[PDB]
Design a protein around this ligand. Structure first.
Ligand SMILES: [Mg+2]
Ligand SMILES: [Mg+2]
Ligand SMILES: [Mg+2]
Ligand SMILES: [Mg+2]
Ligand SMILES: [Mg+2]
Ligand SMILES: [Mg+2]
Ligand SMILES: [Mg+2]
Lengths: 222, 204, 233, 244, 250, 243, 205, 244
């Protein structure tokens, strides 16, 4: 997995690849690793997939309830403190490594959270097995005061570094852009550079090929 | 010692043109000993089918738990659960036991009664959802099925053709797995009708 | 008026009284008399025991709490059993943990606090027994009077129970005399018996009637019952 | 209708908690105790009634110390006072354990206050039947406080409670008017003894015993110590002197 | 100390009456009027903002609350009781449904959950019933639009239109005449405004009225773009100006 | 049946008398307070009455610093006032730890009001006989005044007054705001708002004040503080020139 | 230290001087040999003028500091400004009472008007030691000699900044688990000043 | 104390009756009548709605007839909300049994359990009882069609025809009159409806004021079918029988 977060002049962008693995097998060639915590707070997650979806949805739920109670738009520092205290409580057993970014009344934010409960703030961050390939890129092309267009490319390139060079990453690139005055724009499959070539033959079988012993109708309705 | 390798078994689900299919083998064994050749792993709650591979006591327990939960759902909601919804129920039920999980690999296949869109999903033992548009494989011959499916599968097949495809994916995957086989069953599911066919296969 | 303010200890009357506690203090007043008095070397407890018929035993009034402390009760006996048990435990803990003999002043403080808890909470009921505690610790001889309200007082001598006021006056008179009975246990006891015999009326103190206890310098708390009180009538 | 005074936490039609008010009556029927704040400490004094000659002189100590710098004296139901001091001690310990520094007097006061107030919140508990005068020295000066059964407390220059409270407060107002500069702990000890003796007239039928204690930055080191020996007799004499 | 009130405070009187429930319903009767009207393509719930002073800022007190993006509530009765019922309802929507099924509950079921909370206050130890009646309006895929009333006893019932509070009898009467099953949402908003005008004593305008509808999906209120299955909340509170614009077409 | 006036259960008229009696207790101290919002501040003024000459004036306050940003003025008996202050301080600290940002005045009010609602519904808990006025300069809302009461009600105000003579102060303020047409005192310095406040309290209660008769709290961005006798005097000495 | 969690490595120290106290630290965090964050801030504020330098487990120290910050905010609201000794005690209580599950070496430094600057070091066991200056972190081993030779009590701000700067550059020089920038926080009556020194400066000294 | 406010819901009257239960039964007698009639080939459940209007949504309504299982249903007389509490615990028990034994729960087992819960509120706990009476209509392989009834006391009994709620004496008399052991469902429908028509406290029996259900074993199938009549179906069956 490769996930990145890049801060730009009036916003933040996060991106991730879409390959899900179980050992050396690609269980899902197009999973989604960009989770919505609230409309304008999204989180990229790496590690144990069930854990990143679970911790994200739980905090997102509680964040939704906190917002309705306080009549205020959710803040990234809230999702951050809630996520981290939860992860710390479980001593690393909930394998969620996240890049939480978002815009709220106080501005644009980008933080990272490791499974054990520590957080970091930065202008560009990456996590996942592809973390090193992505960071090599971020360390080569990041510069301060990037434009929205430059940040999307930078974050997109970092993910590509991982897709190509990490066996733990692959398929497509998902991006979510959170700009200070606008609605968050989730760009699912922003880049699709790994389409399978057409197969050399068609494996459609002639009907009757399979030997059937018994056939019967299933009753659905009560 | 690997709870997911004690009893054996596989399940595969595929989507087609206004249809889905879910198939499974019929073996239940104890390590090398074949024990039953009538162990179906596909269950259905209304028009939603769920196949489950893994440790047999959990497979049986989960079917019973989902029947329980879908029965209550139907009573409170006054309508049968949909595939998208059930999928979320399975996931939440599996993650509830995150640190003492059921050793299974569920697979959901069905067609939404309102929109008619074919649906299939797979899960790992702790609930992570894999909503694929093509196929889902599970079991002790999952690698084999992935191999079969990746080659044999092509989008939008008609019920009559999907049958052959899923059947062959299943059959040949099982013949390369020591813990699977001893019979197979395929369900071809359409908006209105569901057909169940038992396949003839080697019994070794 | 009353059944409005005397149903629970948790209710203060308009004049600031705690009726359940005051009613508890009354059970003490219908109990048999017991005297306590001390010199600078010993502390004695003398107690008139009561029977039910002429075919029964005479209920014990003195309880040993440890080798250096004990008490005489008046009122509800089951309650004295509950409180002397606590004192036994508190004495035991001091020895076990600190290898220290519990001070009488501390025993009194502990008794007061235990009694108080039963006067501020609902559902409970005050203790209905009074106790005279004598002991010999690092600061010498001691006599303490405990009342169910939680009030514990250190004295030279005293008495509680029905007609207690008589002996209380004898002691109050004989003070200058008994406070000096040092080194002579038997005399102190005799003063205690003289004292207790001023609260008699029904009969004369006999061998089945009297109970005495003494503790002091080289005397571990010891209870003399029946047979051994003959020499004091 | 009626019955608003049988259960503790009940508000009467005019907003009063009658049970708390009856508790005050138990306090007024009690011995007089006072506190006098001085230029660098506090002095506490209390009247101890001699129910009889059988009471051992100087042994039934009523003033209590909390931690090593707080003195507490109260009037009313003595056991309730002991109960409040036991809590005070647990609270002072908790504070020192977590923060290392001995509990500031304003912090301690509120600790007592919240606990007492807590006993006016439910019908399952009875309010405290005592008014407590307490204080000591901390990081920034001396402090004297008085706490009522309602949980109400404020800081004082001098304080009095019990049967002779009015004479005491009267005498106390005299001291605060004549000496605005402050009062030395030595003088305060003398004056406290006086005030108690004078206050003692409001209960002139029984003989009494005087008990004084103080906490002073110069005479006791900011630690609480009872006034014993020479110091105590000097104050007793000064008292039996200014009476006639 | 401790809640020793483990017994019921609501008990049956000799006539079979549940005293505390009847008294709570009386509390509801003295409350401001609130109504709800169900149309073919929407539902409108409305109430008057009985500001208890002109120094108070009436906007900081919402009587019409969002429970889920497709469900709203209004009440008549004791405001604080409603406020806590709303918190509990928003929460249960998550705990007993979203965290299990990944979707918000259907109106009837959320209604059923609030009702249970109210029933228990009618039997559990040491509590008095809630002094409020709620009108919950919402939409969901399989049931469409619905309006429900929930009483202090916990009984709930579905309505085409109804009114609760002070002039509910007169208002329920105005609604019975005006209501028919071919009304578009704008027409219901209209009838709602008319019905409310009669219950309202003084100034009737967008700053003294609170109206909300459950209608079409509002993508401009979602906050993000990109996911096509979730099209936006159907709940929308009308602004001060939106109400005024409709009051002029009286 | 007749005990319906002792615990929080409905009377046959649907009233909760214990809540009503809790509202009468708030007036037992005979202290009035008012709060107004400036352009970027919020001021609360409360009378200070020290009767007994034996009291230390520095400890008599009904104004509490809840957090670095929220201040609270209580109209009610001191023990209930302090019970509320402690809880509010704990709630405010816990909120910051859990959510990563300072608890808003309005949210603190809602929370304290919810706790009050509970005493109204559960028979074992008695309502507290106090009214709480919370003030701050919120980072999102600007100057704020939210007041909660024994019934569990709370709302935000342009300005507000509380105490036995609440009505006189309220009508005074009401008149000023109908005259000026804005929801706040149009002054830049909190010092002038404080003056406005004191002036209107004097005009309303028909009473003159010295420095030891007032208590003042001011809320500005990132801080809430109380004025000293001497700071108040400087306010008093500045007002004795318009009047 | 748990398998695979982020480590602070670090070169941190706090030095008291005439005007008050200065805290310094590097900015590198590691997961093995990978630098997870090369610009971390190990100087944490638990109160206006009470800060701490964190070393050990990143998660543990953040959790602890977050709780001390809370305890001090509540202390403040009730009893006024806390002493550094009190802040150290709260830190100690948490470190000592949970010694089995935490890896946190914390240096607490703070400024008060009565006490001037103070430094308390809370090493792995949970013991507290008040000292003139303290060094910790994995890079500290290398500067024990240098620091003991060059520290003098009552130095000036300029001199202290220099001492901290030279010490940490040496620590950073030799320890692989230390690197990045040198951050400092100056605590005095005047206020709180944040300083930062880049590699190009400290590396060649 | 708190004893003061306790109504003592679980005590016996001097005559050995349970106060609260007797008072709950009184409440129940004011609820719309629910009737259940057992035939050789099915069961009928009919009920009259309480508190209605022209504006109430009858389509989306259910306040008297609830499905507990695909083979068991209840008719409710009393407080709807209390009923829903119990109904849900019954729905769960039915599923617990199915999970445990892999067979549908026999009717009496479900009925007994529910009654036992009601009984509990009768002997311990200090809570008011549930003001509900149920008529259970159900089928199982051991006894076939069954009809039971339970009241606040927790006593339950079995019937061939029964009613609960308002005007039971009258309804039972009419049922006992026209009921014959060999009845057919179509015939039971008529009787149930006839009976309600003659006992209603309101003008005329109209569809909008009813809830109707039958549990039949349609000979052209096998599984027992529970049918909750829809408004228009109640209007239709009301005409055929002759009430218009
Ligand atoms: Mg596998
Ligand atoms: Mg095989
Ligand atoms: Mg074989
Ligand atoms: Mg007074
Ligand atoms: Mg209450
Ligand atoms: Mg109560
Ligand atoms: Mg280095």
């Amino acid at each position: 997995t490769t996930i990145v977060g890049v801060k730009f002049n009036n916003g933040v962008v996060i991106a991730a690849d879409t390959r899900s693995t179980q050992g050396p097998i690609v269980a899902d060639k197009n999973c989604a690793k960009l989770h919505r915590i609230s409309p304008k707070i999204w989180c990229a997650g790496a590690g144990t997939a069930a854990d990143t979806e679970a911790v994200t949805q739980l905090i997102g739920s509680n964040i939704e309830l906190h917002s309705l109670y306080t009549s205020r738009e959710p803040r990234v520092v809230s999702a951050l403190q809630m996520l981290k205290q939860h992860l710390f409580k479980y001593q690393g057993h909930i394998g969620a490594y996240l890049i939480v970014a978002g815009v709220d009344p106080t501005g644009s934010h980008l933080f990272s959270i490791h499974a054990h409960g520590s957080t970091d703030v930065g202008y560009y961050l990456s996590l996942g097995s592809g973390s090193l390939a992505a960071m090599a890129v971020l360390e080569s092309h990041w510069k301060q005061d990037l434009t929205k267009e430059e940040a999307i490319k930078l974050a997109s390139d970092a993910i590509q570094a991982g897709i190509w060079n990490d066996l733990g990453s692959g398929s497509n690139v998902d991006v979510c852009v959170m700009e200070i005055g606008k609605d968050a724009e989730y760009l699912r499959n922003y880049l699709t550079p790994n389409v399978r070539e057409e197969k050399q033959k068609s494996y459609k079988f002639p009907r009757g090929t399979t030997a059937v012993l018994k056939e019967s109708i299933v009753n659905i309705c009560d | 010692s690997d709870p997911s390798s004690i009893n054996g078994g596989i399940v595969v689900a595929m989507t087609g043109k206004d249809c889905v299919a879910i198939a499974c083998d019929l073996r239940l064994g104890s390590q090398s000993l074949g024990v039953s050749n009538k162990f179906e792993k596909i269950f259905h709650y209304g028009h939603v089918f769920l196949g489950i591979t893994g440790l047999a006591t959990d497979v049986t327990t989960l079917n019973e738990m989902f029947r329980y939960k879908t029965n209550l759902y139907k009573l409170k909601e006054e309508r049968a659960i949909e595939p998208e919804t059930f999928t979320q129920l399975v996931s939440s039920s599996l993650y509830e036991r995150r640190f003492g999980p059921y050793f299974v690999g569920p697979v959901v296949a069905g067609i939404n009664s309102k929109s008619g869109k074919p649906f299939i999903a797979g899960f790992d033992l702790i609930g992570c959802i894999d909503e694929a548009k093509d196929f889902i494989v599970s079991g002790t011959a999952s690698d084999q099925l992935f191999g079969m499916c990746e080659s044999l599968y092509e989008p939008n097949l008609e019920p009559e053709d999907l049958f052959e495809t899923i059947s062959q994916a299943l059959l040949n995957a099982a013949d390369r797995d020591a813990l699977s086989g001893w019979g197979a069953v395929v369900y071809i599911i359409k908006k209105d009708e569901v057909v169940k066919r038992y396949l003839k296969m080697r019994q070794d | 008026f009353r059944n409005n303010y005397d149903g629970d200890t948790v209710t203060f009357s308009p004049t600031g009284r705690l009726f359940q506690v005051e009613y508890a203090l009354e059970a003490i007043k219908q109990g048999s008399v017991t005297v306590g008095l001390r010199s600078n070397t010993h502390a004695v407890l003398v107690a008139l025991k009561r029977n039910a018929d002429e075919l029964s035993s005479y209920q014990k009034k003195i309880i040993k709490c440890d080798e250096h402390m004990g008490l005489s009760l008046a009122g509800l006996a089951p309650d004295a059993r509950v409180l002397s048990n606590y004192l036994r435990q508190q004495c035991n803990y001091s020895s076990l943990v600190f290898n220290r003999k519990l001070a009488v002043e501390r025993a009194g403080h502990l008794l007061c606090d235990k009694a108080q808890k039963n006067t501020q909470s609902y559902g409970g009921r005050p203790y209905g027994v009074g106790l005279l505690i004598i002991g010999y610790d690092k600061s010498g001889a001691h006599l303490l009077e405990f009342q169910p309200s939680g009030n514990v007082t250190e004295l030279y001598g005293t008495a509680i129970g029905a007609r207690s006021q008589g002996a209380k006056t004898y002691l109050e008179r004989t003070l200058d005399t008994f406070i000096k009975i040092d080194g002579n246990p038997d005399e102190l006891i005799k003063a205690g018996v003289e004292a207790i015999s001023q609260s008699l009326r029904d009969e004369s103190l006999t061998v089945d009637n009297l109970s005495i206890a003494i503790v002091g310098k080289d005397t571990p708390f010891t209870i003399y019952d029946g047979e051994a009180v003959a020499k004091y009538i | 209708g009626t019955g608003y005074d049988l259960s503790n936490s009940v508000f009467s039609p005019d907003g009063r908690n009658f049970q708390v008010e009856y508790a005050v009556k138990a306090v007024e029927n009690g011995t007089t105790s006072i506190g006098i704040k001085c230029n660098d400490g506090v002095v506490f004094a209390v009247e101890k009634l001699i129910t009889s000659k059988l009471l051992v002189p100087q042994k039934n100590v009523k003033i209590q110390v909390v931690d090593r710098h707080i003195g507490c004296v109260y009037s009313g139901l003595i056991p309730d006072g002991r109960h409040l001091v036991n809590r005070g001690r647990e609270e002072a310990a908790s504070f020192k354990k977590l923060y290392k520094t001995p509990i500031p007097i304003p912090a301690f006061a509120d600790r007592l206050g919240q606990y007492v107030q807590a006993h006016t919140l439910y019908n399952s508990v009875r309010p405290f039947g005592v008014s407590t005068i307490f204080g000591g020295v901390d990081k920034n000066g001396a402090h004297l406080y008085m706490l009522e059964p309602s949980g109400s407390y404020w800081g004082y220059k001098g304080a009095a409670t019990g049967k002779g409270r009015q004479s005491a407060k009267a005498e106390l107002e005299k001291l605060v008017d004549h000496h605005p500069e402050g009062l030395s702990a030595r003088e305060a000890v003398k004056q406290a003894a006086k005030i108690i003796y004078l206050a003692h007239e409001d209960n002139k039928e029984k003989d009494f015993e005087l008990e004084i204690s103080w906490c002073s930055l110069s005479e006791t080191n900011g630690l609480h110590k009872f006034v014993k020996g020479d110091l105590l007799q000097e104050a007793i004499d000064f008292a039996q002197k200014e009476i006639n | 100390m401790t809640d020793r009130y483990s017994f019921s405070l609501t008990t049956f009187s000799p006539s079979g009456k549940l005293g505390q429930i009847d008294y709570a319903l009386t509390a509801v009767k003295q409350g401001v009027t609130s109504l709800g009207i169900k149309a073919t393509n929407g539902v409108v719930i409305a109430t008057e903002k009985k500001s208890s002073s002109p120094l108070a800022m009436s906007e900081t007190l919402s009587k019409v609350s969002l429970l889920t993006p497709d469900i709203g509530a209004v009440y008549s009765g004791m405001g604080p009781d409603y406020r806590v019922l709303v918190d509990k309802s928003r929460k249960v929507a998550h705990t007993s449904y979203k965290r299990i099924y990944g979707e918000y509950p259907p109106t009837k079921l959320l209604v059923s959950e609030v009702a249970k909370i109210m029933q228990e206050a009618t039997q559990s130890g040491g509590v008095r019933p809630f002094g409020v009646s709620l009108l919950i309006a919402g939409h969901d895929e399989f049931n469409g639009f619905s309006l429900y009333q929930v009483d202090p006893s916990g009984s709930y019932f579905p309505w085409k239109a109804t009114a609760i509070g002070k002039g509910s009898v007169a208002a329920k009467t105005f609604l019975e005449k005006r209501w028919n099953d071919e009304l578009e949402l704008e027409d219901a908003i209209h009838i709602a405004l008319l019905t409310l005008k009669e219950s309202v004593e003084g100034e009737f305008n967008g700053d003294t009225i609170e109206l909300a509808i459950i209608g079409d999906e509002n993508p401009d209120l979602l906050g993000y773009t990109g996911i096509p299955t979730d099209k936006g909340p159907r709940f929308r509170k009308l602004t001060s100006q939106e109400i005024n614009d409709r009051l002029e077409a009286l | 049946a007749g005990y319906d006036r002792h615990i929080t259960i409905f009377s046959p008229e649907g009233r909760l008398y214990q809540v009503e009696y809790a509202f009468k207790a708030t007036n037992q101290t005979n202290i009035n307070s008012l709060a107004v919002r400036g352009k970027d501040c919020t001021v609360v003024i409360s009378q200070k009455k020290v009767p007994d000459k034996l009291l230390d004036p520095t400890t008599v306050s009904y104004i509490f610093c809840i957090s670095r940003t929220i201040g609270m003025v209580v109209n009610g008996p001191i023990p209930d006032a302090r019970n509320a202050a402690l809880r509010a301080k704990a709630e405010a600290a816990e909120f910051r730890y859990k959510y990563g940002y300072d608890m808003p005045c309005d949210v603190l009010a809602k929370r304290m009001a919810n706790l009050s609602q509970i005493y109204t519904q559960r028979a074992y808990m008695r309502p507290l006989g106090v009214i709480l006025t919370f003030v701050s300069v919120d980072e999102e809302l600007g100057p704020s005044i939210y007041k909660t009461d024994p019934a569990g009600y709370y709302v935000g105000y342009k300005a507000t007054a509380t105490g036995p003579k609440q009505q006189e102060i309220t009508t005074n303020l009401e008149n000023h705001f109908k005259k000026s047409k804005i929801d706040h005192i149009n002054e830049e310095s909190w010092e002038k708002v404080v003056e406005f406040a004191i002036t209107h309290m004097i005009d309303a209660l028909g009473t003159e004040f010295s420095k030891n008769d007032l208590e003042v709290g001011v809320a500005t961005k990132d801080k809430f503080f109380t004025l000293s006798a001497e700071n108040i005097e400087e306010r008093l000495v500045a007002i004795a020139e318009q009047d | 230290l748990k398998k695979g969690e982020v480590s602070l490595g670090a070169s941190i120290m706090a030095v008291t001087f005439k005007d008050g106290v200065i805290l310094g630290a590097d900015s590198r965090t590691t997961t093995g040999a990978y630098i997870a964050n090369r610009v971390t801030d190990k100087l944490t504020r638990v109160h206006d003028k009470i800060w701490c330098c964190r070393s050990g487990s990143a998660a543990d120290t953040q959790a602890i500091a977050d709780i001390v910050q809370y305890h001090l905010e509540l202390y403040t609201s009730q009893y006024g400004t806390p002493s550094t000794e009190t802040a150290a005690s709260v830190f100690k209580e948490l470190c000592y009472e949970n010694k089995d599950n935490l890896t946190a070496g914390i240096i607490v430094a703070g400024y008060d008007d009565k006490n001037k600057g103070e430094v308390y070091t809370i090493p792995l066991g949970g013991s507290v030691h008040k000292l003139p200056y303290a060094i910790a972190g994995s890079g500290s081993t290398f500067i024990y000699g240098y620091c003991d030779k060059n520290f003098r009590e009552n130095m000036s701000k300029e001199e202290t900044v220099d001492f901290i700067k030279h010490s940490l550059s040496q620590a950073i020089k030799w320890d692989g688990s230390s690197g990045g920038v040198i951050r400092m926080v100056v605590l005095t009556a005047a206020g709180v000043e944040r300083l930062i020194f880049y590699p190009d400066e400290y590396e060649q000294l | 104390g708190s004893r003061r406010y306790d109504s003592r819901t679980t005590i016996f009257s001097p005559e050995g009756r349970l106060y609260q239960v007797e008072y709950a039964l009184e409440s129940i007698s004011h609820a719309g009548t629910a009737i259940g009639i057992m035939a050789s080939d099915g069961i009928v459940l009919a009920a009259e709605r309480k508190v209605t209007s022209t504006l109430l949504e009858q389509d989306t309504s259910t306040e008297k007839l609830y499905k507990l299982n695909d083979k068991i249903a209840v008719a409710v007389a009393g407080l709807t909300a209390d009923a829903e509490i119990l109904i849900n615990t019954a729905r769960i028990h039915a599923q617990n049994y199915l999970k445990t034994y892999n067979e549908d729960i026999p009717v009496e087992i479900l009925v007994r359990r529910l009654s036992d819960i009601k009984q509990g509120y009768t002997q311990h706990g200090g809570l008011r009882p549930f003001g509900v009476s149920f008529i259970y209509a159900g089928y199982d392989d051991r006894y076939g069609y069954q009809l039971y009834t339970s009241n606040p006391s927790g006593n339950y009994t079995g019937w061939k025809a029964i009613s609960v709620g308002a005007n039971t004496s009258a309804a039972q008399t009419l049922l006992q009159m026209d009921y014959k052991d060999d009845m057919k469902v179509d015939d039971a429908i008529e009787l149930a409806l006839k009976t309600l028509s003659k006992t209603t406290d309101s003008s005329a029996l109209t569809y909008d004021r009813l809830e109707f259900a039958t549990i039949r074993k349609g000979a052209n199938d096998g599984e027992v079918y529970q049918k909750i009549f829809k408004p228009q179906e109640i209007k239709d069956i009301l005409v055929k029988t002759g009430i218009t």
